[PDB]
Every structure is written in structure tokens, then in C-alpha cells.
Design an enzyme around this catalytic site. Structure first.
Site, mmCIF file in Angstrom:
data_model
loop_
_atom_site.group_PDB
_atom_site.id
_atom_site.type_symbol
_atom_site.label_atom_id
_atom_site.label_comp_id
_atom_site.label_asym_id
_atom_site.label_seq_id
_atom_site.Cartn_x
_atom_site.Cartn_y
_atom_site.Cartn_z
ATOM 1 N N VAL A 1 0.952 -1.254 0.200
ATOM 2 C CA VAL A 1 -0.002 0.352 0.021
ATOM 3 C C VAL A 1 0.658 1.319 -0.265
ATOM 4 O O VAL A 1 1.508 1.589 0.781
ATOM 5 C CB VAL A 1 -1.068 0.139 1.178
ATOM 6 C CG1 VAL A 1 -2.172 1.372 0.847
ATOM 7 C CG2 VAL A 1 -1.273 -0.618 2.073
ATOM 8 N N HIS A 2 0.349 1.756 -1.144
ATOM 9 C CA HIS A 2 1.514 3.521 -1.476
ATOM 10 C C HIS A 2 0.732 4.081 -1.450
ATOM 11 O O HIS A 2 -0.033 4.040 -1.615
ATOM 12 C CB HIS A 2 2.309 3.272 -2.599
ATOM 13 C CG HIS A 2 3.585 3.917 -2.775
ATOM 14 N ND1 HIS A 2 4.295 3.600 -1.857
ATOM 15 C CD2 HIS A 2 3.338 4.878 -3.811
ATOM 16 C CE1 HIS A 2 5.439 5.224 -2.216
ATOM 17 N NE2 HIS A 2 4.669 5.918 -3.447
ATOM 18 N N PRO A 3 0.933 5.633 -0.041
ATOM 19 C CA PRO A 3 2.705 5.577 0.004
ATOM 20 C C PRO A 3 2.345 5.158 1.891
ATOM 21 O O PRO A 3 1.478 5.960 2.505
ATOM 22 C CB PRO A 3 2.842 7.366 0.365
ATOM 23 C CG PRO A 3 1.491 7.473 -0.391
ATOM 24 C CD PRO A 3 0.784 6.762 -0.373
#
Ligand SMILES: Cc1cc2nc3c(=O)[nH]c(=O)nc-3n(C[C@H](O)[C@H](O)[C@H](O)COP(=O)(O)OP(=O)(O)OC[C@H]3O[C@@H](n4cnc5c(N)ncnc54)[C@H](O)[C@@H]3O)c2cc1C
Ligand SMILES: Cc1cc2nc3c(=O)[nH]c(=O)nc-3n(C[C@H](O)[C@H](O)[C@H](O)COP(=O)(O)OP(=O)(O)OC[C@H]3O[C@@H](n4cnc5c(N)ncnc54)[C@H](O)[C@@H]3O)c2cc1C
Ligand SMILES: [C]N1([C][C][C]C2=[C][C]=[C][C]=[C]2)[C][C]N(C(=O)N([C]C2=[C][C]=C(C(=O)[N][C][C]C3=[C][C]=C(F)[C]=[C]3)O2)C2=[C][C]=C(F)[C]=[C]2)[C][C]1
Ligand SMILES: [C]N1([C][C][C]C2=[C][C]=[C][C]=[C]2)[C][C]N(C(=O)N([C]C2=[C][C]=C(C(=O)[N][C][C]C3=[C][C]=C(F)[C]=[C]3)O2)C2=[C][C]=C(F)[C]=[C]2)[C][C]1
EC number: 1.8.1.12
Lengths: 486, 490
Positions: free
Chosen positions: B462-464
Site C-alpha cells: 500500500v503506497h504511500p
């Protein structure tokens, strides 16, 4: 000049592919992008959309917006200061964002300079033939040739672009791209779309709006954030409204005209009108395929407009691949990275690997945010005979003190009730994006609801609610919702 | 004549463990349960009450006070993101914080009181429980065993869940010092405070006092050994030391109070073993917590204590007396709320549910609410390196981008994964940074499912987030081979 791999697009997917090919497999890699650093005229650049006009600057701007809540909420905990003195300086936020993004741009440039078999070329890449990438000065295929890169392998990784509807006065509207560079914070703004970009910018604009400002979000259908958990879609709507954002559901702009003061007059399909300083279209993102001259080699598109790919990111043309947003699948940075790594391991390692597009964790930096992994209950209910939904919902004790009593935490686990298998976890509240990452790992270990409830909690946290749900709230049987099993 | 009351289960201590046991026994298995505690609501004189140490004078109120303390950082860190306000006008009102915390705790006390008044076969008795015999718990007016009897509760099964109490060292002037208990009720925030101890309670309170100190105030933390937070990852111990220092907390290591006297102005004059001296307004002792066994009159039935002072139990929480059990802090093992809860639930499923079950004390997720906080689950590398021939350590550390804007560049994020390099099994995960306690919860589930490093790095980020660092670590930073730290394998 001869390369094993030519990558068109120095973005999330392209850079992962390029780096891995050069440093893991000792290949000669050329990477093309249209700018070395962020912003007008082309917005994306070395680093990709995420670094330049995406995840990174939007996250730093949401961090900025979060201080609006923190300053107010601090009072309940005994913090005293002159509230009337509080002002949100947008120019300082944008300058700080600009500096952070430029530092990443320079760091990536140094990466190319310092790494063997990894070369950056500036300009617009397109397919001349099966094995030739031409780099020109501009997107015009008539413009001056800078380079012709002979390539054993071509990776298309040009990403996506804001979708602008064909309405009269669309040229008076902006996208997320221009939102990042607005000289002044808009006093009145319409964000068009119910997706994560519209919601996230509605929150940014809401915190930085000058006095008497108003953020309006419109969406053509009944409920924002299609594809997210229904409880969370309803709760984030409430929480945006509670923070002064006006949600217009079942409304869509029909046209936009210039007012004499420079503001915009929006007419909805319903005949409602609204005057705003800025109209930000965030209705979707489309694969960036037009500048590539794909018809020179016959690279096949889907009807939707994506570059058509098999599970290993291969086009219909041997030695031409496509990863990331250009494949019009999951438009997320880490998916683009995973596809790039998979591709390079397949083509250059002895290790055919394909990206798993199921059970991908994702987040919306709403305030508070969403973290989610796996299926929502309505998609689960079509795939499985017996679905159980576990639901925990509560006002954090800290928001009884802060006064933000609207800030409901939601945790939902969706199971195959036949065997306990967790199919989906859906979180709304502070830390949700951080909580969900390791849930992603749990869904790769065929975690059962009993694996969560037999794990000892970390107290006190929001996350421990995941380990405290033992009894379904309700079920879906043969696709139909009901409190009790039939 | 007033008659004794008979129960399947009598629980001594309405705390994290005892309430879980009591609830489960009555509501899942239809048992008649009595629960005894000394106080119906938080604060002086007995501090703990209905709800236990966590609710009244532990996790719940400390977390609300740490949330309050975090605003010192938010107010300052806001400016880098363009927030402007009159810095000169900023005041931390401790009385408001304490009043807000008291109302939050009282609301929990009142809801537990209601559960008891409302639930059949789950009864609350106010007073001091002790063991008279195998099957009788006496409730007295005070901790003195000569105090008046309020009730005799006949019990087939007895649960000892009386928790722990602050340890006070036998030093001259110990009566001039407080514990965490009094800290929660200080009428004014101290200008100068010494927190004594290197554990989480000392560190957490240091942060709270540091944020609410009046102008000119100073927080000092002392610890008798070289490095605070024994038992935690050494990188994190070193880094949280730097981050407390960077936020203006004075850390005196290898220092220990030998005595305390009162200055003529009523301030505390502290003399350390080193002969160093320090004047403070408050000396908060946080050197440890000891099991509360004295008041139970355990000698009446011969319940065995460990050398260390805890009630001795087998893996099923059984004492040497067949129908007497002990869970939570009185067992003097992991002093954590959710471990007491797990023990209570396992005990009741085993005794009344005929589905035997023992608490797993390994791979327990836990946190320290330092600013920023620690989240940890499983083995630190030096412990792993004694149990496994080949240990890999994966390490990511950086200044979060947001803190290049905020100015708090000292706030380095640390993610460490410890593995058995032989099979890739994750032994331990150690986090320092914002959200670490939230991140580590599902990591606990991962370790229970015997996650390997490849389970982590094959998972898409999962970014950021800070958490995605756990899923981007593919190559060890260094190893331990037969206990020897080395950058590369032979
Ligand atoms: C506002 C916004 C917020 C987002 N937030 C998040 C988020 O929080 N988390 C998340 O996971 N994802 C987020 N995304 C999505 C994410 O940015 C994309 O999914 C990701 O960047 C796609 O990676 P990619 O490799 O396909 O392409 P990109 O990263 O878009 O890279 C494509 C590159 O190709 C270059 N280029 C285009 N055409 C040519 C050409 N002909 N020749 C040479 N170079 C060319 C472009 O300049 C660009 O740098 C966000 C997107 C936006 C717009
Ligand atoms: C300052 C502080 C911070 C903490 N923070 C955390 C944290 O963040 N997370 C965490 O997991 N843990 C934390 N803890 C630890 C946690 O509070 C304990 O591990 C947990 O409360 C122990 O549960 P228990 O059931 O063993 O006893 P308790 O919950 O302490 O309950 C024991 C009860 O017995 C009562 N009692 C004692 N003697 C008698 C008697 N003779 N008769 C009748 N009643 C009696 C007491 O009044 C008390 O209510 C913290 C502790 C402290 C002190
Ligand atoms: C359980 N109970 C009781 C009743 C009944 C019973 C009893 C016994 C046993 C069983 C049952 C309790 C619990 N719950 C709930 O709700 N819960 C949930 C919730 C609400 C709110 C919240 C929050 O905020 N969260 C986050 C984290 C935190 C916490 C705390 C603090 F201070 C800070 C932070 O969270 C709880 C409560 C209290 C506490 F302390 C915690 C939690 C439920 C109820
Ligand atoms: C992979 N990469 C790429 C490649 C490059 C190169 C290499 C080599 C040489 C040169 C160059 C990326 C990653 N990395 C790192 O580090 N990293 C890590 C880090 C630092 C800081 C940080 C943080 O903050 N985190 C938390 C979350 C977030 C993020 C972001 C933002 F804005 C907010 C929030 O995080 C990164 C960077 C950047 C970004 F954007 C992100 C992240 C790495 C790198």
C-alpha cells in the site's frame, strides 16, 4: 546504439523493470521520459505520475490538510492558542511539496548516472518497428529525431492521463495535474468524480480554502467511491459533510462558461448551476497510448483502450510488453512495480512470474482515511454461497475529547462462512492504510477469521478491533443479504 | 442471619483478566459468577477499580494523555505545511487534559457497573477478597485481614486476577516520590520532573510531562543501566533515546537515586549513587511492577509463589491447589492487558467449555507510546541468534519525507524483520515511527500463521505508507551465524 531493454516511461513500473534488468541480470537498459523534473508543461517526469503528480505530492498535501483537524482537536486535550490567528498558507505548502518532489527527481537522475547498463534518454518515445524505439523532441511524430534505440525487448510503461468529458467549456476545467500548481488555494472549488482523487483533493482544498470558501464534490451516481465497502462509502460521505464539504450526488456538469470575474459558471444536467473559482475534473484516468504510434507494429488495444496483455504482460507482438496504468487494470503504483519486476524475472531470469491482481491492499487518504484488501461483501456474495460479514463501529474515545464525534472508526471482515477464509478487510479511520498492509500478508497465508480472533491484541489500538470480531453481524446466502442463516 | 452466597466461579480482581473470565463464564457457559474489587471507579485511594489497572491508571488514560502530548509536535510540525498562528499564545492546560481523561475513565467505570447490575449470574462485590479456604472467598472492608467481613462467597472455582502494583525502592526519602498512580492525578503539571526507570511507563510519562511542562520546565529520565527499554530491539532503543533527547528530554543513563530530601522551598533534592544531584518538583518512580499477592492470604490454602513472587501456574493457569487459578500480572510474566484477557478466555473455555486451550505467550504484539511510538512482535535478533544457527536481519530506516517539511528530521522510521535464515520464518518484527502500534497488529496474525520473509515481500505494498517497508525487504542487511554478527554469510 543497442539495448536488451528499452523502457518508454520512467515511472513506477518502468523504473522497477529498468533497475532490475540492469542490476539483477546485467542487461543494457534504455529508459525514456519527457521531462527530468516535475510540473508544467508535461507534469509527469522521471519518477512517474506517483512521484511527480500523484501519490507522493498528494500524500504530503493531505498531511498538510490534516493539521486543520489537529489544531481544532487539540483544544479538548487542553491546548490553548489564538484560534483567530490561524491561517493556512497554500504557497508554502506548494513550495515544500515542490522541493520534496524535485529532491526525488535529482536522486533518480543520480541513480541513472551512478548505475552501469541503465541510461536515461529525454524525449517522446514511440515504436518505429518491432525492434526500434524512436525518441523525438515533442509528441508530434513529425518532430526532430533525437535517438533511435535498437531493442531486443520493448516495455510500454507510459501510464495514464486525466479523462476530460466532451462537454461545452471543458477547456475551463482543470485536472489533478494543474491542481498541484495552483498559485492560490481556490476559494470555491467543484471536484467532479466520486473516486479517490476527487475525495482526496476535496479534503486538501477544504483545509487550505480562504475564509468564506466552499468545497463542493459532485458525482453522477448515488454514492461516492464505487468499488469500496458500502458502509465505508456511506460513512466517508457523512465525515466529509461534517467537515464542511458539500456532496452533490446524482449531479454531472453539462457545461462550463467563463464569468466576467474569471470564475466558472457550471450548469449540471439537472439544470442546477454553481459558480466556482476552479472546476477539477477527476472522473477517471485513461491509458496513455496515443503518442506511442502502436499502429506502426500492430500492438493490439482492448475495446476500453488499454494495451492488451496476457498474465505475463506480453502484447500480441513478441518482445513488446506493457505494464502499469497503460494496461488499464489496477491503477496503483505498487501493482505497476510488481508487474515490472515479474516481467524482468520472466524475460531475463529463468523464473516466469505473473503478478497476482487479487487481494491487493489499497488506501484512500480521505480524512480520516480508508485501508482495504480483498473483496467487498456484494462481490463475495456472487462468488460464494455463504458469506459472513463481521462489523465493528465506534467513536474513538479521543474524538469524545477532541469534539470530532462524527469520526466513526469502521472495521469489516468478509468471510467465506463455509470454511472461515477471510475474503476482505475494510477499514475507515486514523491509521487504516497502515493497519491494512500486513492484512495483505494474512490473505496470502489463507488467514481464517479464527486466525484473527485467536491472535492477542495490541492495546490500546484501532487495529486490535480486527482480533475482537467472533460473531457475524449478518450474511449473504446465494447472493441475498439476511441477519440470520436461512 | 445474613447468608453466604454460592458461585461456580469467584474472581478476585475486576480487571482485564478477571472481567474477561467472569463475562465468558456467565454469558457463554451459564455459570454463576462473583467478581470482587476494592473500588467502583478510578482514582485515590486505591487507584485501580472496576475495569482494572488498564482502564483506571494504565493503558486507557496513558494513551489519552499521550494523544494530548502529541499536539506539542503537531502544533510545531504544522508550520512547515503552511500553518500560521500566534506561537506566543500556545499553552498546554494539564487540568483540562486530566479532567477529560477522568470523565472518559468514569464513563468506562459506569458502563462496567451497569453490565454487572444487568447480567444474570454475573455479580459484583465491593471489598478486599482473600482466600479463607479451598472453596470460600472472604470479602473484607480493607486489605487488613482483621477488618470486618462484608461477604463470604462459596466457590467451586477461584480465579486470582489481582494484577500488580508499582515497585518503590527502599531509599531515604522514598516518601517524597510518587508512582504512575499519583502521576494521573497531579493537580498541576510539574516544572521539573525526574522519571526513574528505563521501561515503557517511564518513557511514556517523560513524553507526557515534556509536552505539558510550564515555561522553563525540564523533564529528566534516569535509568541505572547503559540503554533504556531493555527487551526491545537495540536499534530502536538507541533511536528512541536520540528522539527523546531531540525533543528536549534529558536522559541520565547509568544513574540511580540513592536518596531524596526536601529543599527549604519544598522542591525535591535528588542525590544519585554517583554523587550527582538534581532539584525537581516531582520524582516519579517507574522501576517496575510487582504482583499483588500479599492481601490474598494465600498461606491459608498453600498457593505456591515463584521465587520471583508471582503465583506459580502451569500452562493452563492452574496453581498447586486444583480449583484455584491465576491469570494476568499476578503470574509475573507478560504484564499486558490482552495477554490477561487471552488467559481468562482460555481458562474459562478449558474449565467450563470442555475445550481445553492454553495461551500462547510467544509472538505477542506490543507497543510503547513514545513519540514517535514502538510496535513489536516476536524475537529481538540477539535472542533469536542464541536459538537459531543462522539469523537474517532486514532493516529499513529513513527520515519520513513529511518530516523534511515538518522540521522533525530527527524522527527516523525503523522497520526490522528478524528471520531464521534456514527456512525464512519471521521470528520478530520491530517498528519505530508513526502508526507502528497499528501496523504491528496484523503482523501478530502473520507470525501466528508462521509467515516467512517471502510471504511479506511477495505481498503488494500500500503506497504511500510506512508499513510497505515490511513488503520491500528482499535481502538481509546482516546475519548472525552461531551467535556471531556478520554483514555476509561465510
Ligand atoms: C493524483 C493521483 C494520485 C495517486 N495516488 C496514488 C496512491 O496514493 N497510491 C497508488 O498506489 N497510486 C496512486 N496513483 C496512481 C499511480 O500514480 C499510478 O498507478 C502509477 O504511477 C502508474 O505507474 P506506471 O509505471 O504505469 O506509470 P507512470 O508512473 O504514470 O509513468 C509513466 C511515465 O511515462 C512518461 N511518458 C508518457 N508518455 C511518454 C512517451 N511517449 N515517451 C516517454 N515518456 C513518456 C510520463 O512522463 C510518466 O513519467 C495516483 C495517481 C494520481 C494521478
Ligand atoms: C501506567 C501503565 C500503563 C500501561 N499501559 C499498557 C498498555 O498500553 N498496554 C497494555 O497491554 N498494558 C498496559 N499496562 C498493563 C496493564 O494495565 C496490565 O497488564 C493489566 O491491567 C493486568 O490485568 P490483570 O487482569 O492482571 O489485572 P488488573 O487489570 O490490574 O486488575 C486487577 C484488579 O484487582 C483489584 N484488586 C487487587 N487486590 C484485590 C483484592 N484483594 N480483592 C479485590 N480486588 C483486588 C485491583 O483493584 C484491580 O482492579 C499498563 C500498566 C500501567 C500501570
Ligand atoms: C467489551 N466491552 C465491555 C462491555 C461488555 C463486555 C465486558 C467484558 C468482556 C466482554 C464484553 C469493552 C470494550 N468494548 C468497546 O466497545 N471498546 C471499543 C472502543 C470504543 C472506543 C475505542 C477506541 O478509542 N479505540 C482506539 C484505541 C484506544 C482505546 C482507548 C483509548 F483510551 C485510546 C485509544 O474503542 C472499548 C472500550 C473501552 C476500552 F478501553 C477499549 C475499547 C466493547 C464492550
Ligand atoms: C525503490 N526506490 C526507487 C529507486 C531510486 C534509486 C535507487 C538507487 C539509487 C538511486 C535511486 C523508491 C523507494 N525508496 C526509498 O528509499 N523510499 C523510502 C522512504 C523515504 C521516505 C519515506 C516516507 O516518507 N515513507 C512513508 C510513506 C510516505 C512516502 C512518501 C510520501 F511523500 C509520504 C509518505 O519512505 C522512498 C523514496 C521516495 C518515495 F516517494 C517513497 C519511498 C528507495 C528507492
Amino acid at each position: 546504439k543497442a539495448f536488451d531493454l528499452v523502457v518508454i516511461g520512467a515511472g513506477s513500473g518502468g523504473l522497477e523493470a529498468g533497475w532490475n534488468a540492469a542490476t539483477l541480470y546485467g542487461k543494457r537498459v534504455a529508459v525514456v521520459d519527457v521531462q527530468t523534473s516535475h510540473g508544467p508543461p508535461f507534469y509527469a517526469a522521471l519518477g512517474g505520475t506517483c512521484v511527480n503528480v500523484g501519490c507522493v505530492p498528494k500524500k504530503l498535501m493531505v498531511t498538510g490538510a490534516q493539521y486543520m483537524d489537529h489544531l481544532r482537536e487539540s483544544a479538548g486535550f487542553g491546548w490553548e492558542f489564538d484560534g483567530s490567528s490561524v491561517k493556512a498558507n497554500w504557497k508554502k505548502l506548494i513550495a515544500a511539496k515542490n522541493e520534496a518532489v524535485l529532491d526525488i527527481n535529482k536522486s533518480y537522475e543520480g541513480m541513472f548516472n551512478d548505475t552501469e547498463g541503465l541510461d536515461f534518454f529525454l524525449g517522446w518515445g514511440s515504436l518505429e518497428s518491432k525492434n526500434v524505439v524512436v525518441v523525438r523532441e515533442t509528441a508530434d511524430p513529425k518532430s526532430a529525431v533525437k535517438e533511435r534505440l535498437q531493442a531486443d525487448h520493448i516495455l510500454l510503461a507510459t501510464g495514464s492521463w486525466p479523462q476530460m468529458p466532451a462537454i461545452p467549456g471543458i477547456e475551463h476545467c482543470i485536472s489533478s495535474n494543474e491542481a498541484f500548481y495552483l498559485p492560490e488555494p481556490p476559494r470555491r472549488v467543484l471536484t467532479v468524480g466520486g473516486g479517490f482523487i476527487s475525495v482526496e483533493f476535496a479534503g486538501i482544498f477544504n483545509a487550505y480554502k480562504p475564509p468564506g470558501g466552499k468545497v463542493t464534490l459532485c458525482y453522477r451516481n448515488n454514492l461516492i467511491l464505487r468499488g469500496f465497502d458500502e458502509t465505508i462509502r456511506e460513512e466517508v460521505t457523512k465525515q466529509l459533510t461534517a467537515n464542511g464539504i458539500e456532496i452533490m450526488t446524482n449531479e454531472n456538469p453539462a457545461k462550463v462558461s467563463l464569468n466576467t470575474d474569471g470564475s466558472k459558471h457550471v450548469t449540471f444536467e439537472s439544470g442546477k448551476t454553481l459558480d466556482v473559482d476552479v472546476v477539477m475534473m477527476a472522473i477517471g484516468r485513461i491509458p496513455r497510448t496515443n503518442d506511442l504510434q502502436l499502429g506502426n507494429v500492430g500492438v493490439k488495444l482492448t475495446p476500453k483502450g488499454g494495451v492488451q496483455v496476457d498474465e505475463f504482460s506480453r502484447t500480441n507482438v513478441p518482445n513488446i510488453y506493457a505494464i502499469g496504468d497503460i494496461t488499464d487494470r489496477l491503477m496503483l503504483t505498487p501493482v505497476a512495480i510488481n508487474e515490472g519486476a515479474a516481467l524482468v524475472d520472466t524475460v531475463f531470469g529463468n523464473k516466469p512470474r505473473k503478478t497476482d491482481h487479487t487481494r491487493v491492499a489499497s488506501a484512500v487518504f480521505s480524512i480520516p482515511p480508508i485501508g482495504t484488501c480483498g473483496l467487498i461483501e456484494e462481490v463475495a456474495a456472487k462468488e460464494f454461497e455463504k458469506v459472513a460479514v463481521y462489523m465493528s463501529s465506534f467513536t474513538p474515545l479521543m474524538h469524545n475529547i477532541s469534539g470530532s464525534k462524527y469520526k466513526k472508526f469502521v472495521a469489516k471482515i468478509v468471510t467465506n462462512h463455509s470454511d472461515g477464509t477471510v475474503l476482505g478487510v475494510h477499514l475507515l479511520g486514523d491509521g487504516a492504510p497502515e493497519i491494512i498492509q500486513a492484512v495483505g500478508v494474512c490473505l496470502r497465508l489463507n488467514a481464517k477469521i479464527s486466525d484473527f480472533y485467536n491472535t492477542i491484541g495490541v492495546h490500546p489500538t484501532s487495529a486490535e478491533e480486527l482480533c475482537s470480531m467472533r460473531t457475524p453481524s449478518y450474511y449473504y446466502v446465494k447472493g441475498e443479504k439476511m441477519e440470520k442463516l436461512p
